[PDB]
Amino acid sequence: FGSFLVSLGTSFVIFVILMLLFTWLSRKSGNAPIYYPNRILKGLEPWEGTSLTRNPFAWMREALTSSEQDVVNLSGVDTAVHFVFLSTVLGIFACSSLLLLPTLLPLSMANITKKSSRLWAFLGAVYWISLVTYFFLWKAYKHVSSLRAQALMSADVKPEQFAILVRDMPAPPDGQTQKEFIDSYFREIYPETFYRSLVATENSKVNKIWEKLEGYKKKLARLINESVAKLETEQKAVLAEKQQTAAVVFFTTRVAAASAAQSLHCQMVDKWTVTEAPEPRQLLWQNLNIKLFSRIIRQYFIYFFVAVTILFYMIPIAFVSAITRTVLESFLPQIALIVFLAMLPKLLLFLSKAEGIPSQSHAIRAASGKYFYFSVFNVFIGVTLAGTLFNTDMIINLLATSLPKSATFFLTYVALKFFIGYGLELSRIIPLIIFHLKKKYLCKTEAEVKEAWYPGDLSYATRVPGDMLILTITFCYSVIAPLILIFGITYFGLGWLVLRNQALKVYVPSYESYGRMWPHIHQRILAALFLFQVVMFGYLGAKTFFYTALVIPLIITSLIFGYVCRQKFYGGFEHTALEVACRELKQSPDLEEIFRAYIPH
Amino acid sequence: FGSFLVSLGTSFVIFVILMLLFTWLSRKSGNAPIYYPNRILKGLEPWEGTSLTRNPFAWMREALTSSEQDVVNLSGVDTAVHFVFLSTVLGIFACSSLLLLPTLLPLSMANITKKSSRLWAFLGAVYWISLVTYFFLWKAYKHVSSLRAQALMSADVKPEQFAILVRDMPAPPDGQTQKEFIDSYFREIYPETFYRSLVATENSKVNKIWEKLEGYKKKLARLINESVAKLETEQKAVLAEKQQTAAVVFFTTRVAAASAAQSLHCQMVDKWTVTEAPEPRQLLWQNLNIKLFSRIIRQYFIYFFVAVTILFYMIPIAFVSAITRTVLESFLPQIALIVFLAMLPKLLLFLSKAEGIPSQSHAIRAASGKYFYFSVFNVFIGVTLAGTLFNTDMIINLLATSLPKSATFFLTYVALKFFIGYGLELSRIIPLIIFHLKKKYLCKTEAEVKEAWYPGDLSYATRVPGDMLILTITFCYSVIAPLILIFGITYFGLGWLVLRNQALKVYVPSYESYGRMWPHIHQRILAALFLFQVVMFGYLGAKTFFYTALVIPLIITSLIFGYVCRQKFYGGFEHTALEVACRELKQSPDLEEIFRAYIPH
Numbered sequence A, B: 001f002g003s004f005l006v007s008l009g010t011s012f013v014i015f016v017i018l019m020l021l022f023t024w025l026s027r028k029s030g031n032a033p034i035y036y037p038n039r040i041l042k043g044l045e046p047w048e049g050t051s052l053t054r055n056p057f058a059w060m061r062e063a064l065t066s067s068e069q070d071v072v073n074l075s076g077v078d079t080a081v082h083f084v085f086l087s088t089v090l091g092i093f094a095c096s097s098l099l100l101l102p103t104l105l106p107l108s109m110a111n112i113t114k115k116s117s118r119l120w121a122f123l124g125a126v127y128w129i130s131l132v133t134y135f136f137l138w139k140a141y142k143h144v145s146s147l148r149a150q151a152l153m154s155a156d157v158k159p160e161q162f163a164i165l166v167r168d169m170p171a172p173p174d175g176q177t178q179k180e181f182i183d184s185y186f187r188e189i190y191p192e193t194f195y196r197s198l199v200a201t202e203n204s205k206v207n208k209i210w211e212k213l214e215g216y217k218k219k220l221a222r223l224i225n226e227s228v229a230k231l232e233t234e235q236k237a238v239l240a241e242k243q244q245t246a247a248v249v250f251f252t253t254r255v256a257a258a259s260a261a262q263s264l265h266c267q268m269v270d271k272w273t274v275t276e277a278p279e280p281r282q283l284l285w286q287n288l289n290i291k292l293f294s295r296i297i298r299q300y301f302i303y304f305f306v307a308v309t310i311l312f313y314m315i316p317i318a319f320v321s322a323i324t325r326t327v328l329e330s331f332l333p334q335i336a337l338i339v340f341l342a343m344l345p346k347l348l349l350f351l352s353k354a355e356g357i358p359s360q361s362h363a364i365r366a367a368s369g370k371y372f373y374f375s376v377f378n379v380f381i382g383v384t385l386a387g388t389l390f391n392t393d394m395i396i397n398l399l400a401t402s403l404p405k406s407a408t409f410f411l412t413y414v415a416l417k418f419f420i421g422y423g424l425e426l427s428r429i430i431p432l433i434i435f436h437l438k439k440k441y442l443c444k445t446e447a448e449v450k451e452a453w454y455p456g457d458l459s460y461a462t463r464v465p466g467d468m469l470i471l472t473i474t475f476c477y478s479v480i481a482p483l484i485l486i487f488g489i490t491y492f493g494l495g496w497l498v499l500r501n502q503a504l505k506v507y508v509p510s511y512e513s514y515g516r517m518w519p520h521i522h523q524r525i526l527a528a529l530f531l532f533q534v535v536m537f538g539y540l541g542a543k544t545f546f547y548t549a550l551v552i553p554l555i556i557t558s559l560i561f562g563y564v565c566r567q568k569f570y571g572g573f574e575h576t577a578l579e580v581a582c583r584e585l586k587q588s589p590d591l592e593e594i595f596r597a598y599i600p601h
Helices: A003-021 A056-065 A068-074 A077-094 A097-104 A122-153 A178-189 A204-208 A211-216 A233-240 A254-262 A292-312 A314-321 A328-341 A344-352 A360-389 A394-427 A429-441 A460-480 A483-505 A517-543 A548-574 A578-584 B003-021 B056-065 B068-074 B077-094 B097-104 B122-153 B178-189 B204-208 B211-216 B233-240 B254-262 B292-312 B314-321 B328-341 B344-352 B360-389 B394-427 B429-441 B460-480 B483-505 B517-543 B548-574 B578-584
Strands: A163-166 A194-199 A247-251 A274-276 B163-166 B194-199 B247-251 B274-276
Touching: A003 A394, A056 A483, A068 A077, A068 A122, A077 A122, A077 A460, A077 A483, A077 A517, A097 A122, A097 A483, A122 A460, A122 A517, A122 A548, A122 A578, A163 A254, A178 A194, A178 A247, A178 B578, A204 A211, A204 A233, A247 A254, A254 A274, A254 A578, A254 B254, A292 A314, A292 A344, A292 A360, A292 B548, A314 A328, A314 A360, A328 A394, A344 A360, A344 A460, A360 A394, A360 A460, A360 A517, A394 A429, A394 A460, A394 A483, A394 A517, A460 A483, A460 A517, A517 A548, A548 B292, A578 B178, B003 B394, B056 B483, B068 B077, B068 B122, B077 B122, B077 B460, B077 B483, B077 B517, B097 B122, B097 B483, B122 B460, B122 B517, B122 B548, B122 B578, B163 B254, B178 B194, B178 B247, B204 B211, B204 B233, B247 B254, B254 B274, B254 B578, B292 B314, B292 B344, B292 B360, B314 B328, B314 B360, B328 B394, B344 B360, B344 B460, B360 B394, B360 B460, B360 B517, B394 B429, B394 B460, B394 B483, B394 B517, B460 B483, B460 B517, B517 B548
Parallel strands: none
Antiparallel strands: A163 A247, A163 A274, A194 A247, B163 B247, B163 B274, B194 B247
């Protein structure tokens, strides 16, 4: 069936490696390795350009010769935690060789029958891969934990070690304006450990004209006046009547700061709630300056709109599933299934702006927070159940009819989603086009000294979820059709290269995050396993083997690991250690650096 | 059927009110109101004895004329939170009059049929009582919250405002013994906010002979030497090799103390875990001095032993259920069902010693923690399903066969559990017997100046769970057989009297707890409601009315309330407010008071 798709896939994926064979030598040599332009202005990496023949050592095995020790200093440890995540999962399928070889040895038809049961080789090997998954994510859980500790004890002085964010202040006015009253409160409740506080603004109206003002003073050589009017009356009115219940304050030492960040303050935790303040580029001020009382109802309504998005998103799955030359008419619904889910990062970003999370670093984990929960019921059980609902004891023959067919559809889909996508992301067609067009245009604006540059963030919004759907497909369809695993293997074995290249090539992190997403994705992969064992119980459930000592210990194990891992590491990550704070203490404190660390502008 | 049980119930319950008509006038006038012996030695309450005729104002309406304003100062606010709990639930069934009157108006037989549907009057009134339950427990949730705040801001100086408990210290020895090393750690990590620390002991071996030594020096006039030997070598050996990873330390001001209690410390929260230290009489030192790494496995195995206790405890339910003069042969299995579950507080105490909770105040909430989870599946669905499994469309006729029969069994059981039990607890047969016998005996020991006294703790271990089972029965069987509600009513309407009397009569609290159990029991009653709506879905599920807008909004409401209440109050209670700490600050600090606040002895 899908022999055509590996044919053409290999064809123009080796053709987009052929365009990379033509890339490195060029006048665009500045645009391709734009990461080091972060380190120094002209530094591209050494000026030899790193070319060999196919450059196997010059990119692939330079990515092999450099290792995780420099991944933390070169770029933020966030890139480190994603790289070590994909390596953990690489082991997750690298063990699976000893599943796939045996299950390939036993591998209208003889098909699968009740007596041979296969489930000491099948379910025994899913016990094998389940066990080694626990081993990998446990091992690397501790590992990335000590990597995070390592990055916190070795971190330099940043303003956020002294920073705490306070959300709900008393609404009522007792006799003074906000500023003086809050400062008097802190003075009464602390023995001179406080510094000063900065209030919050509704400025998103003057911000709507501010970012646009940062463009308006850019339009002078292409309107430089009028906006100062909305910089005047509107902003003054907002300041006079509408500065919210939220603000930020800072303290003398790191220890007092974090300790303050952990504890609740007032008798009613509906008042004076406080969370550790992230970095200005991490936090989102627009979604900040809102009320938690309404945040409850926002979690409510947003969680309703996911319920409308799932059932509204059912119909494309039935559109594509009925399809499975004539396989290019499977192309159109598959690539349209991509570009129909390729908007899902933007859709769940439009939901991820309105949900109320203070930090975009903690917002993204909620963006995949929508994506996983969204993808389980449509791109998997909607697509599987789509294979079942079409082409119809008897229910057993239908499940055993769909699982191979929906397995070839799933395999073909991770083949297009993987093999072609990493090729596109390799030679980055959009930077090479915007190089010609914008270098022809942005020169006309007298900006020729400054390229657009900045390839963009490592962008987990398009990264981790697109890594989630494949996770689900791999796990679930591993047991029923193990061949997907050998082409699930080929996924990360190539990915581990390219993104690593990418990691050291263009992306400069927009997050200094120390692994925020990692515990999220960590309970995520566990959930994915749980789906593999329950859906697996759907597989065996028709096959009728002994399931007591089979399914009940699997679910019991999943449960106890959920408990033990949450109550073990989870809280350990969610906050910063104060021992690292006092033991860090480089003995170079200051004050004025923290004031301009935010500012309204 | 159960007309006999209200006959005799009224008979000897008015006979045990007749023995209270004979009680107050006596030479035992010191033993009956033993609460004020806490206030002063001889003070019994005013020496008029509080007698009227039946003494309606002298106990009942003295309990009416005194109110919750003095419940907090007279005895601990714990008694206050239990009293206000039973008052909340009193409203929970006081609203229900407007359910029971209508559902009594519509009230082999015409029985219940599909078309009239009754569920605008039935399910509409369970929407009515569900709604007003939310209203009562919400209202009184805020109410008891401000009562707790009120008791914390008005509290006097206790040692536990300066106290924090640390559980896991570093296991390895780096060059000094524990004491000096821990103190140096605190010195390095705090700017002289610390005071001094007290280590932990394995002394339960010298304690095994210590409490017994406190008896051995009492045996001198009835062995006063030998134990000092096990006070020597064994204790010294333990001290030399086995003082655990746990200890307690204290700080200069309340604020630093609590703030320290909230935050995690080290990078690995598997090390340096810290919780707010309760009072010595609240905490349990024997279950203290254990490891959390093993506490995980203890929650594991204990939660397995509940799984053996439920299925091992199935058989008495089938023993009693097949029963329903011949009704005294229903007596024997009912009273044996009492005394068979009357050991459950002791059984779940034997489980509640081994589970690892540091505070017996937080342990008891886990004792009912076993009791509710234990009672849902046996005394309710085991007893209901016991009525179903016996006396056998058709399944509909069987559920509609059991629910009335198991409803008369349930009603008869809350009739014996309520009416007779509060009568026994009124005139307290065991104190009046131990008065004669021990006043005849303990005088022979030359202790005649000191009675045993001390009626015992208010003893939630036998209180809150015995209040849980009735909660379940009331809710679940309210819709199918509303008459139980009018005899569920009669439960608390009498209880509100007697225990209140009891509250002001004998019990001196063994807990200074400020309402620890209240959030526990608060999500508990909510769970009970949830069982009423799901089991209710079992009731209507055979009746076949429109259940979309019926059951799905009920479960959605239960969910959103779970979220909003947990994320609203729950964390707000679980710890103490630091604003109350700084705003309390009576400006009379000390040091030496905290050292002897514990001590090994």
